[PDB]
Design a protein around this ligand. Structure first.
Ligand SMILES: Nc1ncnc2c1ncn2[C@@H]1O[C@H](COP(=O)(O)OP(=O)(O)OP(O)(O)=S)[C@@H](O)[C@H]1O
Ligand SMILES: [Mg+2]
Lengths: 419, 240, 209
């Protein structure tokens, strides 16, 4: 009986299990404390059980292990990781470990780890020798991320719209810029469930920071892959450590020649949190933001790449535009030009309720030649020629109109050529 | 194509481009032109704070060593790699050997110096420190020709109209100090060849009554000189 | 010092060593101090070189202050001028002689202990030595030894000890290592000195670089 099963179950199962075998007044404490107490009481019988989570190392040599369902929160559910484990299994941050856990004896509160049985979804012994991420060789996004879902709704119409306006590649680095109330979050949804439906092989990861709790809870119940989200109620350090540990966990996953995709909303919020938490360097720019603050989220964004010998790391991060606050710009032109692709949106298109609001002319990609073939490259270039003249709102109206009657993007291509 | 055709030997020069203008492949073409036409000269491709994939592509599509700094690490790495490349260039000068440097980009290096230089109270419009000005001046003037033997030369890359305000100030002071500056975009060509500032100064006095040859000094010659492409015109601003 | 490391260092080094245990009173520490310095200065006066290694000067000054009776002139925190007077003479006994002999003393001081005594001795003693080698704990987190930072480490009168060739190469290393980062400096120096066999070749490989 692993921690994951009772961690995932709702309150009803927890309270029923507590009242069945002798937990008193268990309904009036926080859920992480509830699972801690009930699992400690159950493990008082000395039955070793499996564990799951992601480990991290604090300032001291001792390390902790967290759970994904707990939104990567440090609490009573944390699992001990002794430094001896770090030496004897070359452990580093972000490795997902599965194995027997140790019930707590006198002198300790949390649960320790008896043994390891699965490191990064792999046998611990064969993972002792491994290639570090630092010396990996970046490469272009050769593999096209075919996200055309083909289900039959206007949401699929939006999917086809950014298929015709963007070239999403496996392992690329993408930025999304849009004004508030333009369609960012559920565009990221589109990306998430389209990747889930079209590419089940690759793992889906969605990172949300300082977002409203209702958005978090509707995102958690809509995406197939696991999603990590920390609301605005928590301090800046919460978001900072969430982002660090999630990006380095994705690093560890892609080190195993895996295809990892991270959807970030937003990156401006991450930069603001880092600026808040980082010590001042004494060299402040316009808007109350100093120099070294921007480095951390900016290397964070730069972590995305494609590995020549196996594995890819795609990051699709949103950037806020024209919100009336100067630092939002500061970040906007600080990250501008550092992404493999840019996706722009306009609020005025959303004003007339034409959706999505992607700016066809402004949106673009770097090195389209290597990603696709020559025939489809020219086939999209001729669309660029024919759709460039009229206005972007007129362009989108025209595109959605003559794409509504067409089942797929290809049939759209051969239906345009005859005209 | 050939560096001797464009940059020659011993003299500095710049190329300035806007975003989305074709910088990377142009630098590639310059690189292999140097490699084939003049294999004797030591190739040196340098990159500052740009995407790692392009760094790998640069260092894999050329033969010379490419010391580059991706855009992940902070600007201290950029500044210190700047001093160490300039010191190794000076050593190669003492080695009695010619070198060619393809740096990209000097606007990146200049505003990295700006955001890293300690505050000295000599800031100007836009918070540009004077130290972050004449340290780049020292680096850019270290590219002088070697009159005793061999000839060092560098090709410069600069970015224009990037939606910011820091870049055009250093661009105009490079204009003040530039030897030769290749241009790609539309407006800045007329901005340089026909200075709008000088035009406004002249128009403030309208047609200034320049006595005698002072009026005839300003001359413009367009010669359709023979070029391998075929009849490429050359326009010269003849002054006295 | 504890017996184990004392016994270990006794037969790592061939030089004579005198060590004293913590539990016994500081008075015997004081006495062994004056006998060791007196025999050292007698050997120096015989035109023979002497090198002394000491650990630690500020904490033995603390011990002397604790064991010395209070003269009545109490400074901040109970410190006495006469309490630091004897360690001050002990440390200043280091005296090179042009006629003959030498009495080199290399003593260490401990700071960041929670008691400002050792601090007070530190700013009362700093600047009175012909050299200084600052050392910090910030390097041991990254597990790099030695933890000898180079930017703020210095010495007095380099122009006389050796030839200006080593001086100018050291100056070049300083100017290429000072503005750049501290952890960066430490890793750079350890790596660049790792594959190099000797210091002469190390200077040569900076020169070629
Ligand atoms: N393809 C679409 N299908 C349905 N509704 C859409 C579509 N595109 C936009 N909308 C509407 O757009 C409105 C705003 O969408 P949001 O995603 O909430 O905006 P936003 O860009 O996320 O900005 P935030 O999250 O409020 S700060 C909603 O009322 C949606 O109904
Ligand atoms: Mg939203």
């Amino acid at each position: 009986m692993n921690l994951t099963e009772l961690k995932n179950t709702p309150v009803s199962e927890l309270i029923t299990l507590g009242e069945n075998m002798g937990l008193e007044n268990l309904a009036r404490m926080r859920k992480q404390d509830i699972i801690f107490a009930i699992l400690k009481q159950h493990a008082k019988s000395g039955e070793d059980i499996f564990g799951d989570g992601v480990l991290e190392i604090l300032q001291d040599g001792f390390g902790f292990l967290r759970s994904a369902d707990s939104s990567y929160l440090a609490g009573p559910d944390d699992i001990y990781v002794s430094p001896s484990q770090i030496r004897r299994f070359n452990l580093r941050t972000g490795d997902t470990i599965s194995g027997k856990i140790r019930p707590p004896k006198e002198g300790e509160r949390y649960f320790a780890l008896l043994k390891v049985n699965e490191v990064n979804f792999d046998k611990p012994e064969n993972a002792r020798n491994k290639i570090l991420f630092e010396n990996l060789t970046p490469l272009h996004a050769n593999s096209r991320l075919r996200m055309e879902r083909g289900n039959g709704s206007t949401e699929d119409l939006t999917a086809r719209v950014l298929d015709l306006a963007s070239l999403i590649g496996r392992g690329q680095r993408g930025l999304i810029v849009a004004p508030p109330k333009a369609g960012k979050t559920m565009l990221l949804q589109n990306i998430a469930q389209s990747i889930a439906y079209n590419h089940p092989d690759c793992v889906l990861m969605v990172l949300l920071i300082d977002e409203r709790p209702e958005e978090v809870t509707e995102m958690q119940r809509l995406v197939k892959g696991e999603v990590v989200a920390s609301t605005f109620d928590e301090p800046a350090s919460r978001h900072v450590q969430v982002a660090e540990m999630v990006i380095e966990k994705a690093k560890r996953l892609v080190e195993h020649k895996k295809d990892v995709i991270i959807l970030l909303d937003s990156i401006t919020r991450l930069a603001r949190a880092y600026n808040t938490v980082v010590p001042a360097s004494g060299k402040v720019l316009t808007g109350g933001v100093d120099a070294n603050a921007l480095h951390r989220p900016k290397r964070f964004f730069g972590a995305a790449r494609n590995v020549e010998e196996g594995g890819s790391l795609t990051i699709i991060a949103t950037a806020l535009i024209d919100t009336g606050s100067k630092m939002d710009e500061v970040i906007y032109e600080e990250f501008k030009g550092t992404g493999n692709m840019e996706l722009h949106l306009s609020r005025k298109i959303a004003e007339k309720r034409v959706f999505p609001a992607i700016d066809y002319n402004r949106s673009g990609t770097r090195k389209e030649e290597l990603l696709t073939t020559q025939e489809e490259l020219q086939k999209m270039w001729i669309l660029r020629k024919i759709i460039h003249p009229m206005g972007e709102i007129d362009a989108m109206e025209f595109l959605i109109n003559k794409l509504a009657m067409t089942k797929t993007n290809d049939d759209f291509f051969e239906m345009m050529k005859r005209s």
